[PDB]
Amino acid sequence: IIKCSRETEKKYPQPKGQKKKKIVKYGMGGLIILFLIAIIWFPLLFMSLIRSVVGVVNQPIDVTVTLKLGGYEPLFTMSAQQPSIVPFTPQAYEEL
């Protein structure tokens, strides 16, 4: 590896005492800085991304009511499912 570096240095001499090229410095440094900041930040993104549960409304599709005395027999039993379950309209919510 060192020999390859030395041959490369021989092939393209650099002037005696000079500013390092801005383009190479910017590319290498931006790459490293972006990599380090990504390491710092992305785990937070994933942790906050998996726990993105969204509330889904569940509305009872059936309601059953039973009136029972002692242990003899349900005196009354009624179940309402589709047309007798009226969801609240905004106007009704306002009234409430």
Binding site: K3, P43, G55, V56
Partner: protein, 96 residues
């Protein structure tokens, strides 16, 4: 409202600890490139490596042709070169 049961373990010691552990492990691993680089400066700042490269090639070639005694002697020479830094300075000096 209901959401799919993907709650699992939540933050506030739940999964935060894993994030801290991963960031510290990666931090140590990256620091490995920055911490004790100077220590290995006597083995990587060589101006000319021609003699050492030739010596290693000689070891390979002798090992190929089956004359083991030379291989042992060449290996001894190489080990001693890496055993004394000052002889390494003398040996890797830029040729004139």
């Amino acid at each position: 409202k209901v959401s799919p049961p993907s709650l699992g373990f939540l933050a506030g010691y739940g999964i935060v600890g894993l994030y801290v552990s991963i960031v510290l492990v990666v931090g140590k691993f990256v620091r490995g490139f920055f911490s004790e680089i100077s220590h290995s400066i006597m083995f990587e700042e060589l101006p000319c490596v021609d003699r050492i490269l030739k010596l290693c090639q000689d070891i390979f070639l002798v090992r190929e042709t089956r004359e083991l005694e030379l291989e042992e002697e060449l290996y001894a020479k190489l080990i001693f070169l890496y055993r004394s830094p000052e002889t390494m300075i003398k040996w890797t000096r830029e040729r004139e």
